[model samples]
Target: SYDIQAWKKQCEELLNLIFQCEDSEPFRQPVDLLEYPDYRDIIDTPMDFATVRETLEAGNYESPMELCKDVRLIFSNSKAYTPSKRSRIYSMSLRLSAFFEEHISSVLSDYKSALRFHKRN
Candidate 1:
């Protein structure tokens, strides 16, 4: 598991550089309003409306997974990028997913011990 302070620093640095945004912290505001759906026909899709609105409004992601999914969709939905650029973005998405899972799991474990066991004391 990664140490908290160092992990926090690296995480912020990675987010700022990776997303190329000018935020004081990581998880910058989502630039678009498209939610990924479980089903897709020729013209329709399901969606988590709250996730879509909150994410687009202020980037208040519900979980790390939701954040990653929407961010990937944000890039994927864009027709402006060429094939190579899209591929690079896709690669980064995977890397981001791995990082968030590791970081969240580490913090969650610490919280469980610090709080879950402390209640008995």
Candidate 2:
């Protein structure tokens, strides 16, 4: 498992950077009322809203597999890439599915579905 200190530190930095704007951590767009992160502040970064929802529903995700275990599980072998590490489906589901429980390959189909639903409004 990854160390908690590093993760907590990064989270604090984000809180400081975003809270500096108006005491509100920017999550979505529409910077008119809030400071929208531009190319400099955030360079096409990603968020884990689906994980947040999963957390709300299931308390917290012990592993990405738990979030996506409901989906099919492929039994294959993979090796870790040194320095140059390379590489979805319900986009976020795939992401959550692999977040914890040994790093496996996945996509953001779950995220895409959420985006599609959001755009409809």
Candidate 3:
């Protein structure tokens, strides 16, 4: 069984760390279609950190994997929309995605260790 409460707390902390990143500004909110008219034309689905946090707070995510899915979408959408590897947004997407994956793996491993400890006792 999953300790959903603990997972939620960890996710919240992880989001806070992402929010503090300097490059996180672009991903903090949904892209303005008015500013980038071609965004909708290229990306079928859009995701943002603000939306992810809202969904997590609303208890919409049943598992850590569900939360990760949306979080990953944010970077994927950015990369898809801004295809230029040299562009700031594109590089930010890569950096943030790698950061998120690294931290999430540690979080999951910590949970797994706790699970093992409990099983032994």
Candidate 4:
């Protein structure tokens, strides 16, 4: 089993890195339906960094994987609603998602190594 406290700390670090990205502005808040009226029709689940942060702070995630899923959803929702690949929102989602995947993978691997080391010791 993983330590919840450690996992939460890792998640917060990753979120802060994502928050620093230039393209992160749009994803920081919930989608504005007034700006994109059809967003609700296309996205079954809406997610944003602000919501994720709130959920994290509240200790709502059962595991670290749940937090990753919510973060991925923000990009997926963007890809689904933005329509064109050339559009700024669509491109930004792809970039941010890739950035997130790389860092999250690193974090998880380090976590796995720690678990293994603890097990052996």
- Identify the leading candidate in terms of lDDT: 3
Q: How good is model 1 by TM-score?
A: 0.35
Residue 16 of model 3 has an lDDT of: 99
Q: Which clashing pairs does model 3 show?
A: none
C-alpha TM-scores of all predictions? 0.35, 0.19, 0.86, 0.85
Question: Candidate 1: where is the Cα deviation over 4 Å?
Answer: 1-27, 33-86
- The models' CA-based lDDT, in order, is 0.41, 0.31, 0.84, 0.83
TM-score of candidate 4 relative to the true fold: 0.85
In model 3, the Cα lDDT at residue 100 comes to 94
Q: Write the per-residue lDDT of candidate 3 for residues 25-65, one digit (tens) a residue.
A: 89999899999989988989888999999999998987677
Please give the lDDT score for candidate 1. 0.41
* Distance from true location, Cα of 82 in model 4, Å: 1.7
Tens-digit lDDT track for model 1 on 1-121? 3232333333344444545422212223433335523224221332222344454446355334444465445334432332465455445545555555555464446544545455755
Q: Which ranking of candidates, highest TM-score first?
A: 3, 4, 1, 2
RMSD of 1: 8.8
1-100 in candidate 4: lDDT tens per residue? Answer: 4452577788898889889999898999988889888887889999999899999999798666788898988987887787688999788888888898
Local distance difference test, candidate 3: 0.84
lDDT of 2 by residue, 69-96 (tens): 4222210101111112232123323333
